[PDB]
Amino acid sequence: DEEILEKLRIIVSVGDPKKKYTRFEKIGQGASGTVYTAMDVATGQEVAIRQMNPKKELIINEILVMRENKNPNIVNYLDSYLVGDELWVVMEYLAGGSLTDVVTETCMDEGQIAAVCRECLQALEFLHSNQVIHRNIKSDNILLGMDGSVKLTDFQSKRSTMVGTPYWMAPEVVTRKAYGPKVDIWSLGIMAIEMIEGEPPYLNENPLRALYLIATNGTPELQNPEKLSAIFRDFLNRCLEMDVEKRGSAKELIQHQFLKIAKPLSSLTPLIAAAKEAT
Amino acid sequence: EEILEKLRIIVSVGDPKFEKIGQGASGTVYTAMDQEVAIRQMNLKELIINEILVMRENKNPNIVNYLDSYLVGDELWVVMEYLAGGSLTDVVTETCMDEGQIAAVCRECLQALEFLHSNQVIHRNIKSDNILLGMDGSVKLTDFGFCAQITPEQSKRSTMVGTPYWMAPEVVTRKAYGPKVDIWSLGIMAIEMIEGEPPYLNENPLRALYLIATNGTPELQNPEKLSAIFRDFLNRCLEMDVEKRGSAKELIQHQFLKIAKPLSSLTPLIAAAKEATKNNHL
Numbered sequence: 102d103e104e105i106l107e108k109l110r111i112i113v114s115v116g117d118p119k120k121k122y123t124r125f126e127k128i129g130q131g132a133s134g135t136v137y138t139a140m141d142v143a144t145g146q147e148v149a150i151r152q153m154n155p156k157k158e159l160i161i162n163e164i165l166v167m168r169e170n171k172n173p174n175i176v177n178y179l180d181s182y183l184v185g186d187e188l189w190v191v192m193e194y195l196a197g198g199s200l201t202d203v204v205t206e207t208c209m210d211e212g213q214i215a216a217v218c219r220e221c222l223q224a225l226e227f228l229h230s231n232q233v234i235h236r237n238i239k240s241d242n243i244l245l246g247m248d249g250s251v252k253l254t255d256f257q258s259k260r261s262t263m264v265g266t267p268y269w270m271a272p273e274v275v276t277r278k279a280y281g282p283k284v285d286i287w288s289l290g291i292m293a294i295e296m297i298e299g300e301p302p303y304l305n306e307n308p309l310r311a312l313y314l315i316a317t318n319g320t321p322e323l324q325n326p327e328k329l330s331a332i333f334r335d336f337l338n339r340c341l342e343m344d345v346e347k348r349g350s351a352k353e354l355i356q357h358q359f360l361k362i363a364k365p366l367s368s369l370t371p372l373i374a375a376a377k378e379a380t
Numbered sequence: 381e382e383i384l385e386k387l388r389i390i391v392s393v394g395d396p397k398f399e400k401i402g403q404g405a406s407g408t409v410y411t412a413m414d415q416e417v418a419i420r421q422m423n424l425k426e427l428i429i430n431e432i433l434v435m436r437e438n439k440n441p442n443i444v445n446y447l448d449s450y451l452v453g454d455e456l457w458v459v460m461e462y463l464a465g466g467s468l469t470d471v472v473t474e475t476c477m478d479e480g481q482i483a484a485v486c487r488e489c490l491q492a493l494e495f496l497h498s499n500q501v502i503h504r505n506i507k508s509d510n511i512l513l514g515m516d517g518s519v520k521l522t523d524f525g526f527c528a529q530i531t532p533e534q535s536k537r538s539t540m541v542g543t544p545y546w547m548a549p550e551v552v553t554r555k556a557y558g559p560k561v562d563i564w565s566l567g568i569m570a571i572e573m574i575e576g577e578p579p580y581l582n583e584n585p586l587r588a589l590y591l592i593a594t595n596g597t598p599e600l601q602n603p604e605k606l607s608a609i610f611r612d613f614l615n616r617c618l619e620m621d622v623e624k625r626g627s628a629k630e631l632i633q634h635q636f637l638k639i640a641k642p643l644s645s646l647t648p649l650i651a652a653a654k655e656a657t658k659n660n661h662l
């Protein structure tokens with residue numbers, strides 16, 4: 102408990118978070134811990150707060166790592182507090198909802214998809230340079246701002262029965278091989294397909310059949326290949342190479358020509374407006 | 381929306397009014413009482429609805445008793461009977477069972493299956509992890525999330541449902557299949573009881589699917605250690621030809637079951653498993 106506490110108390114701030122924040126509202130769904138949205142009473146900034154507390158954790162190290170390493174395209178650590186038999190971690194939050202609501206209720210054009218893909222690749226290049234693998238690049242984990250900001254958020258037994266379909270997972274992942282950061286590039290490709298088709302792949306499959314198809318055939322079958330520009334199709338091909346060596350890195354894909362048709366992020370705000378109206 | 385209203389409509393809206401057993405996935409499980417009772421909580425589909433409805437409508441002494449359910453939006457609760465003897469997995473994984481103890485478990489499982497199959501229900505997820513044990517050596521089946529309800533109208537399924545290592549070949553290859561898929565899975569559970577693990581467990585789940593699809597009837601590591609009668613029972617459970625494979629009704633009459641010991645013979649296995657688990661944690 103010594104090492105554990107002391108490191109906290111270096112970084113954790115003094116004060117009562119109960120007075121610094123108002124308008125708490127549950128949204129998680131912790132584990133691990135419970136996650137609320139709330140508002141800074143001094144600045145009006147809206148934040149997300151996770152309250153938790155404990156077998157052990159890297160918690161302190163991640164916390165330390167994320168306080169030292171921030172990036173505009175991820176939701177960043179803001180502050181932390183030890184509150185009684187609890188720990189509170191305060192992180193950034195955005196009010197424009199998830200990419201999956203946009204994907205579900207609108208039809209994105211290639212310029213908008215390129216804008217999103219570019220923001221995500223900026224997050225991924227950053228994370229990968231810090232030896233972090235997200236592992237869950239999917240529309241549910243992309244948060245949008247009212248100004249069109251884009252941030253990544255939220256970053257097994259063989260005997261267990263599979264419940265959800267792990268549609269975003271790379272072949273090397275589903276076949277339980279050793280794997281690296283490029284699994285995130287695969288999931289990005291899947292997410293780009295989701296944006297253009299308006300729903301994730303494998304929707305009509307059992308988890309096991311989907312698992313088999315991913316391992317065996319790799320990329321899902323494009324429902325309507327004719328509809329995509331050559332340059333978008335090239336970008337997808339680069340993301341969804343089954344051979345990890347041939348698959349692009351985040352750094353390389355940042356240079357891809359598809360990203361150069363990206364609209365300004367302001368082009369996403371009409372999509373957020375549609376999605377909120379729809380929901 | 382529709383499915384969640386359906387779920388809502390099954391649920392009791394009464395006052396549940398908090399010991400812990402262990403936290404699984406989908407979601408985490410807990411102990412309690414009000415008669416000793418076991419309660420599950422989860423906070424999000426049809427699998428839940430199916431499980432609840434199928435359990436409600438198919439009560440039987442060899443099936444874990446469903447009691448009630450209460451939903452709180454957010455989280456959802458399912459209340460079942462508590463079996464304090466743990467799972468058959470703890471036993472096969474930490475102890476050696478004799479043929480008499482194995483026959484006893486097989487008999488009880490076959491009783492559950494004959495009942496389910498007679499009610500047009502296929503379990504599709506038979507494995508030691510889904511067999512729970514009472515402190516008196518009771519043997520009960522759970523986990524009805526993946527069960528299929530068949531009809532003369534539609535008597536077969538073709539979907540890859542189950543857990544790879546226990547799935548029958550006709551299931552993994554997406555052929556039209558029926559209740560006897562459960563008999564295959566029971567045979568694999570018998571292999572767990574002999575060897576500690578189902579075949580191919582060291583392989584990744586997809587490798588296992590391929591091996592099942594290609595190998596068919598799995599081979600024992602040491603067939604010579606088995607009695608001829610036990611070996612015959614296994615052969616009948618794991619026949620590639622569905623027609624030749626035994627039904628639950630048929631296998632209940634098999635000579636292997638005649639050597640079953642009293643269910644009391646299982647409590648020393650439970651004790652050993654408990655002690656082993658304690659060993660593992662320290």
Ligand SMILES: Nc1ncnc2c1ncn2[C@@H]1O[C@H](COP(=O)(O)OP(=O)(O)NP(=O)(O)O)[C@@H](O)[C@H]1O
Binds near residue numbers: 404409418461509
């Ligand atoms: N009615 C019950 N009585 C006693 N123990 C139970 C009961 N139901 C579940 N358990 C146990 O409580 C734990 C619950 O976790 P759980 O996820 O339900 O099992 P698990 O199957 O091995 N994980 P999963 O593969 O996702 O189902 C397990 O260890 C079970 O053995």
Ligand SMILES: [Mg+2]
Binds near residue numbers: 262509510523
């Ligand atoms: Mg189970």
